[PDB]
Amino acid sequence: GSSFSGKYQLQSQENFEAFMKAIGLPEELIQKGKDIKGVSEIVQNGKHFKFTITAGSKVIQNEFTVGEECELETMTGEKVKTVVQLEGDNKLVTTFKNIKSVTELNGDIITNTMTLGDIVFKRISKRIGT
Ligand SMILES: CCCCCCCCCCCCCCCC(=O)O
Ligand SMILES: CCCCCCCCCCCCCCCC(=O)O
Incomplete structure (x- = not known):
């Protein structure tokens, strides 16, 4: 699977x-x-995920297997041990540093929502080629 x-x-x-x-x-x-x-x-291969977030010179590389312990490197550079789960057929869900993260894919649109206490940080992204 590579959904x-x-x-x-x-x-x-x-x-x-x-x-x-x-x-x-x-x-x-x-x-x-x-x-x-x-x-x-x-890059998804079944339960195995690798993701790269690039903003200028700043590149954050992460990997996890759904259902297994992973170590996620966050925006500050703090690394946190957690687990990422699938929710429904189109969501990836995890918590780290008290932040609830929901990554939802619908067609070519990915919506990532991170909420810390009352603060909700929502990102909408669109597929840009292969
Ligand atoms: C060359 C100048 C350095 C630029 C530094 C960019 C600062 C990073 C901006 C943060 C982008 C947010 C990425 C969060 C990704 C996510 O929520 O999954
Ligand atoms: C950098 C903070 C760690 C991210 C924790 C969420 C892990 C599961 C989601 C991985 C897919 C990444 C999609 C991000 C889309 C976006 O940049 O908004």
């Missing part, structure tokens, strides 16, 4: 600044990063 596989780019986001402040992203990276339409690349 999530693809190359995607941010179209729009909500609450970037409030969320990144709350998690402790350096102010310099908040200000430089707020208008970056980052590129996300996902």
